[PDB]
C-alpha cells in the first residue's frame, strides 16, 4: 500500500536505527499499517522464502517485497464479513427471526445514512429471495451482497 | 455504530451495482 505511510510506521518500529526491525514484530508492523494477519499467516509468509527463512532482522525492502509477493493473501484479511453488517438487522429483530420484511428494509436502505434509491433498491432486489409474507433472510442477503 | 453500519453496507451495495452495469456493457 501507501509507501509514504509504510515507511513512516517503519520508522517509529526501527529504534536501533539500523534501517530493519526484529523479526518478531514483522506481525505488528502488518498490523499497525492495516493487515490482520494469524501468526501462522506471518510465519507462512516469511518461511516461503529462503532468503528471510533464518533472517535476524528485516529491511523495509525485504518488508515491502514481502507484501508485494502475497499482496491478495494479506488484503483478504481485512475484507468484510457477513457478521460485521448483520447487527444493523438484529437491533431491530426483537424476536431474532432471521427474517426482515422488504418494506423495513426499503425503509433502512432508502431513508438512512447514506441513502440509496428507490431504484437502486429495486435493481438489487431481483437478485433477493422475496417470503410470500414479504420476508428475506437478512443473512442470506447479506452473504450475497458480499460473494465475489 | 448502527448508522454507519448501515452506510458500509450502502457502499457495498453501490459497488455491487457498479459491477452489474459493467457485465452489461
Known sequence: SATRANKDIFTLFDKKGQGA?????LGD?????????????VQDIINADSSLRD?????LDQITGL???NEKELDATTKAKTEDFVKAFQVFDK???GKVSVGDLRYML???????TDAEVDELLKGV???????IDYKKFIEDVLRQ | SVLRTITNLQKKIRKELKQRQLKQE
Open chain 1, 110 to 116: 432508502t431513508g438512512l445514512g447514506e441513502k440509496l
Open chain 1, 55 to 59: 533472517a535476524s532482522s528485516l529491511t
Open chain 1, 29 to 41: 508492523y502488518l498490523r499497525a499499517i492495516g493487515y490482520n494477519p494469524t501468526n501462522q499467516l
Open chain 1, 21 to 25: 526491525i526484529a523479526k518478531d514484530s
Open chain 1, 129 to 135: 429471495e422475496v417470503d410470500s409474507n414479504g420476508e
Open chain 1, 67 to 69: 507484501i508485494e509477493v
Open chain 1, 95 to 97: 424476536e431474532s427471526t
